[PDB]
Design a protein around this nucleic acid. Sequence first.
RNA 1: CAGUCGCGUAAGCGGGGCAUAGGAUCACAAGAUACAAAAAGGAAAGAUCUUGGAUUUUUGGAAAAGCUACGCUAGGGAUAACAGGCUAAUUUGCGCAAGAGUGUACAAAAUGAGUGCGCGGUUUGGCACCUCGGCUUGACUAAUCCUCAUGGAUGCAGAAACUAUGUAGGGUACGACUGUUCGUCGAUUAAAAAGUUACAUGAGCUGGGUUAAAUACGUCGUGAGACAGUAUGGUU
RNA 2: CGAAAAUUUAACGGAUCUAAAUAAUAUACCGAAACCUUGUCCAUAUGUAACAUUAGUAAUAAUAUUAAUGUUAUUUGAUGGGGUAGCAGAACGUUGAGUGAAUCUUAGAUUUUUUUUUUAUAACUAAAUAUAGAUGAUAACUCAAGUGAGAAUGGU
RNA 3: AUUUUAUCGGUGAGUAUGUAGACUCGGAAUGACAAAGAUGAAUCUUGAAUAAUCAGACAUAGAAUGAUAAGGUUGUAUGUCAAAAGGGAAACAGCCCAGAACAAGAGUUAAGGUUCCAAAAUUAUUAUUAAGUGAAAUAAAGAAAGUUUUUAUA
RNA 4: AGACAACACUGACUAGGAUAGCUGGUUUUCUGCGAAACCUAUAAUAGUAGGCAAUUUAAGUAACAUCUUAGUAGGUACAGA
RNA 5: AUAAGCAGCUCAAGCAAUAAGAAAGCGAGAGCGUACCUUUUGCAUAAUGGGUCACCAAGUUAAUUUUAGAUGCGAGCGAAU
Lengths: 138, 98
Amino acid sequence: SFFRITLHRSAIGLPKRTHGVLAALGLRRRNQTVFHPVEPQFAGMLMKVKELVRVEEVPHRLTKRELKDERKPDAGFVVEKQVRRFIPGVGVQDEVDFSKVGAVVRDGKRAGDLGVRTRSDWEVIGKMKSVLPKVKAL
Amino acid sequence: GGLLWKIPWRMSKFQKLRQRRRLRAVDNVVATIENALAKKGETVKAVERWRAEMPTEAEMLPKDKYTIFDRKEKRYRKGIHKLPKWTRVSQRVNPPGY
RNA sequence: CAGUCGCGUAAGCGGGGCAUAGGAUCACAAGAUACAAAAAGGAAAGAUCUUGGAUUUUUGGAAAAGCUACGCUAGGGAUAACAGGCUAAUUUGCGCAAGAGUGUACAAAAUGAGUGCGCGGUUUGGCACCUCGGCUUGACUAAUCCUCAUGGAUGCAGAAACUAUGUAGGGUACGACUGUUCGUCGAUUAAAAAGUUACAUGAGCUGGGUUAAAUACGUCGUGAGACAGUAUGGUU
RNA sequence: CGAAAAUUUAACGGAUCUAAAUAAUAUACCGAAACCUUGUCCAUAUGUAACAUUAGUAAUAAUAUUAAUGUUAUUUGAUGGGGUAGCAGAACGUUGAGUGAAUCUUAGAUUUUUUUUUUAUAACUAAAUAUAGAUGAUAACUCAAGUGAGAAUGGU
RNA sequence: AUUUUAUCGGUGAGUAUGUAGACUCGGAAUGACAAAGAUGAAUCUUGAAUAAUCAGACAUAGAAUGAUAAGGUUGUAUGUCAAAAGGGAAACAGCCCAGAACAAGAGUUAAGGUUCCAAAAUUAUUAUUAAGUGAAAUAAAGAAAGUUUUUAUA
RNA sequence: AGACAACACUGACUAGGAUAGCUGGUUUUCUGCGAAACCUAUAAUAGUAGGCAAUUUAAGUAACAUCUUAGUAGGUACAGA
RNA sequence: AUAAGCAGCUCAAGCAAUAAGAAAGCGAGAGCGUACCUUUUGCAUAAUGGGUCACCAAGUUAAUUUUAGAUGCGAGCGAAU
Ligand SMILES: [Mg+2]
Ligand SMILES: [Mg+2]
Ligand SMILES: [Mg+2]
Ligand SMILES: [Mg+2]
Ligand SMILES: [Mg+2]
Ligand SMILES: [Mg+2]
Ligand SMILES: [Mg+2]
Ligand SMILES: [Mg+2]
Ligand SMILES: [Mg+2]
Ligand SMILES: [Mg+2]
Ligand SMILES: [Mg+2]
Ligand SMILES: [Mg+2]
Ligand SMILES: [Mg+2]
Ligand SMILES: [Mg+2]
Ligand SMILES: [Mg+2]
Ligand SMILES: [Mg+2]
Ligand SMILES: [Mg+2]
Ligand SMILES: [Mg+2]
Ligand SMILES: [Mg+2]
Ligand SMILES: [Mg+2]
Ligand SMILES: [Mg+2]
Ligand SMILES: [Mg+2]
Ligand SMILES: [Mg+2]
Ligand SMILES: [Mg+2]
Ligand SMILES: [Mg+2]
Ligand SMILES: [Mg+2]
Ligand SMILES: [Mg+2]
Ligand SMILES: [Mg+2]
Ligand SMILES: [Mg+2]
Ligand SMILES: [Mg+2]
Ligand SMILES: [Mg+2]
Ligand SMILES: [Mg+2]
Ligand SMILES: [Mg+2]
Ligand SMILES: [Mg+2]
Ligand SMILES: [Mg+2]
Ligand SMILES: [Mg+2]
Ligand SMILES: [Mg+2]
Ligand SMILES: [Mg+2]
């Protein structure tokens, strides 16, 4: 097993020898948690700072990433609609609606390659003077 | 002296409660260490020495929990809160007779 | 390690003493080394090694007496005198406990050895946080001199006084001596008690004391001068 | 009870409390710039991608790449954060100078103010007032200093 | 000349009593030295370059000194202040917590507290006190039909 | 009378030429690290030097700190006569 | 004009634009906070210095001797011809 050691109090006004015990354990700030195997060389290290730490027997050792995720709160939100944006390195990302799921990113050296309406696209729309909404729709 | 260090000779029921819990907390650190090693069949001289000449909070008398020995006092007793860093240092045993 | 001496059968020991208490450089002096030698040959004066002579005793090593009150400058309050602060040995400040003893008798009416446990912050001191008296006008304390109430008193007949408990409203004066607070004395008085407040109060007064320059006396000093001395005078 | 001191209750901080006191216990809650979480700033590392500049190396008549520097993002969900004497690094500002026979200015350069915005000892936007075509102002890079003052009983 | 002592000094004996800076037969903890292993925040050494500082103060323990006085003087051990803000100690350099890069949060905690001033309990249990004792700086010896409990006892 | 010698006299005024281990002052921002008030020597004790040692950043590390296990030095508290 | 503020900071009612749009500023009330510098073991200190504002006012230059970084040449370098 392992010793889950957490610094509960400080050693500010304590002798210098006590600071070295904590430095050898890896405890640099309050409430910092470390893991060490259950061995005499670590038990004796704790009997010197037993008035400052909290110890607990645990089966396995937790990783730096898994030890910080137990205090992570739920985000509380989910981005379901992203508007069109421009990523400096990738390019222009079109609007995506994750509610119906499609993040297509178009990059190029011409406006038509970006996937946006250009002055030409507006001129062809204006020349389509014949299209008319259906009478039923109106 | 003319410099005032207003330290009362006795402790309040709140300071005493925290003292009981700090002595209780230390006992759990030692017991946690002693039990973890016993499962592996190991021992540490520091632990064997603590469990031999140091009592647990439930085994201590109130006088031993809130006072300490001081040869300069009338009755050789003194408030434990008058010890430096008394909330972070261990103090449970006094000379026999006092 | 080299050199070469002693003792020992030998192994071996010997670079003073059972151990722990003797200062250099410089200069000077005596020996060695063969280094350099201000044109050159020599030398002088130098260099290296060994060695010697030191209350260089302020002993990491100057050849060294005082006064200043006629004093000056830069600094310190990093060290004093007054006051404040801390302390309470001491006190011409008090209390309580115990009770040898005195009291013709009888401990505790009065009295109280040598002591113990304390309070207080008046005296003389310690530390080093910090570089006078009088007059006028108060305020405050109560451990009380008078005035008011009162317990005890073989030792409270009365009177007066003694002791003690309450109590600080008011009062506690005048003069001679001394610079005096203090103290001594005269004569009255119901009584002529104390203390704190920067030993209250000098941007309210006084300046006699202390008290810089002047001067004399005594004492001290070779002397200039000095003195917890004395004397006259001295911008408040 | 012993237990008395001098401005005023006078070392419960005060009000007040018969517990809101004292002793032996139990639980909850409050509680710091400590800690956690979410973001930001700064310092110092690790790789990666992209943008710009400069300088090279190739390609191009029917653009790619190399290096340095600056910058943003991102990977290790990186590490670190009080400070006197003192040591060190990086910058800003002021005055003059080079590029400068340059650039801009009545379509308003400059105006000791006000205002707006930007991680900002600084610059910028706009407004108001007046009116200059250079003895005006000025970016960037660089060079040199009589270069930055609430403190000297400082000086005028 | 002579003997005798529950008188003084001296000698011998005692596994008798006390006494301790220069007594230690016994003898800790702590601290110190080095070895291996493990852990850790590079905290270490050296090279090159190159400072400040040289009345410290207080707390705690234990001593010398003083008077078992001093916010006194002087060593030792530890820490803080100095050069450290913030919370607690009414106010506070040195004590108890805790080391300030900037914000947000009825967030989690330390010391410390929770009737009101003033954020949080007028929260629960068992006893004592009647004196505002006390409640965040213990005045002593001592006295006494104050009260409670316990232990003996009529 | 250390009195007077033109503001000054225990030695004037003026011009030229000083020092001061003492006191005071020493001017913009950001960032990183961060002491000492001890020892030794000194004609020193308000000063100074050399160390301990703060800083800069390179070269090393069998570095340094702490614990564990085994080992060692030394006589305090205590206890004892 | 009922109040005991180093005159700032945290919280903040209200007043404030003749008009569609647009709130700078002043601020009742509540709370926190004893100037600055110097010098010190330690200062709100009743220790030092300043009436306010503006300007002047302090690690510079030379020679010499070094170190780091950068860079030229390289067993030669530099200078001068
Ligand atoms: Mg005081
Ligand atoms: Mg010759
Ligand atoms: Mg000497
Ligand atoms: Mg010597
Ligand atoms: Mg004279
Ligand atoms: Mg002093
Ligand atoms: Mg009678
Ligand atoms: Mg009346
Ligand atoms: Mg007086
Ligand atoms: Mg006066
Ligand atoms: Mg006359
Ligand atoms: Mg009161
Ligand atoms: Mg933090
Ligand atoms: Mg920090
Ligand atoms: Mg810093
Ligand atoms: Mg203008
Ligand atoms: Mg000035
Ligand atoms: Mg022995
Ligand atoms: Mg002292
Ligand atoms: Mg520190
Ligand atoms: Mg200092
Ligand atoms: Mg603090
Ligand atoms: Mg309180
Ligand atoms: Mg809450
Ligand atoms: Mg409340
Ligand atoms: Mg009371
Ligand atoms: Mg004369
Ligand atoms: Mg004269
Ligand atoms: Mg630091
Ligand atoms: Mg120190
Ligand atoms: Mg000498
Ligand atoms: Mg000096
Ligand atoms: Mg009003
Ligand atoms: Mg004043
Ligand atoms: Mg002042
Ligand atoms: Mg002045
Ligand atoms: Mg200037
Ligand atoms: Mg200047």
